[PDB]
């Protein structure tokens, strides 16, 4: 699934 941050989000 997606992260909280999103795939485009920071690490």
């Amino acid at each position, epitope marked *: 699934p*997606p*992260g*909280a*941050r*999103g*795939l*485009t*989000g*920071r*690490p």
Partner: antibody, heavy 116, light 112 residues
């Protein structure tokens, strides 16, 4: 399907105020980091403001060019992100996209023109 | 501010051929082992569509032909084979830290 609908753009005088809002569906909203990004032909894509999820204390960040003027916030119960904008300037003119899961998903955009 | 510079500005590729767009970062967007570099496509009159994350990894339902590469400060986006519907502007974008910054954009024209 994810849907992001922005609202409340339009015309406003320099110095005036404006509140954009962004309804979202198709992902667990309370978990998602949400942003606002703007586009003008002069300056391209500018990230404007971030608001993070409940787990990160609804932490906000802002571009330097809007600090002290723009407030981002969210209503997790209504799946809405707001962007209050104050003391608006001609250079704030652009298309304002609301994005979800940082930049994974983007709304259609709403147009803000700042001009007397 | 990590500044992103794309090149070229515009670019005309025949159908079925390779399109290569570059993105140079003012400093390293590597955080951990992951290069925090994303790519977006903007067709006319539309928002940007997310394509590639982590320099080379592809978003959900993004065709095999879109693929990125590079690490550190230098990055590419390859479209191959190019198709009619790939006419668009392509933005690189850095998520290493706030502020998040985008590139200038590169228009891909389709030769016909």
């Amino acid at each position: 399907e994810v849907k992001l609908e922005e609202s409340g753009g339009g015309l406003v005088q320099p110095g005036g105020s404006m509140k954009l809002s962004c309804a979202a569906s198709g992902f667990t909203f309370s978990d998602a980091w949400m942003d606002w990004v703007r586009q003008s032909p002069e300056k391209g894509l500018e990230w404007v403001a971030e608001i993070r999820n409940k787990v990160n204390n609804h932490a906000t960040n802002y571009a330097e060019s809007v600090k002290g003027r723009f407030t981002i916030s969210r209503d997790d119960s209504r799946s809405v992100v707001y962007l209050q904008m104050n003391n608006l300037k001609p250079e704030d003119t652009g298309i304002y996209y609301c994005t979800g899961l940082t930049f994974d998903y983007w709304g259609q955009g709403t147009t803000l023109t700042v001009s007397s | 501010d990590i500044v992103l510079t794309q090149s070229p500005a515009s670019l005309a590729v025949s159908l079925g051929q390779r399109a290569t767009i570059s993105c140079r970062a003012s400093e390293s967007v590597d955080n951990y082992g992951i290069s925090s570099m994303n790519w977006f496509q903007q067709k006319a009159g539309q928002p940007p569509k997310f394509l590639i994350y982590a320099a080379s990894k592809q978003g959900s339902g993004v065709p095999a032909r879109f693929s990125g590469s590079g690490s550190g400060t230098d990055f590419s986006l390859i479209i191959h084979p190019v198709e009619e519907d790939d006419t668009a502007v392509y933005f690189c974008q850095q998520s290493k830290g706030v502020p998040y910054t985008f590139g200038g954009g590169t228009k891909l024209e389709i030769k016909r």
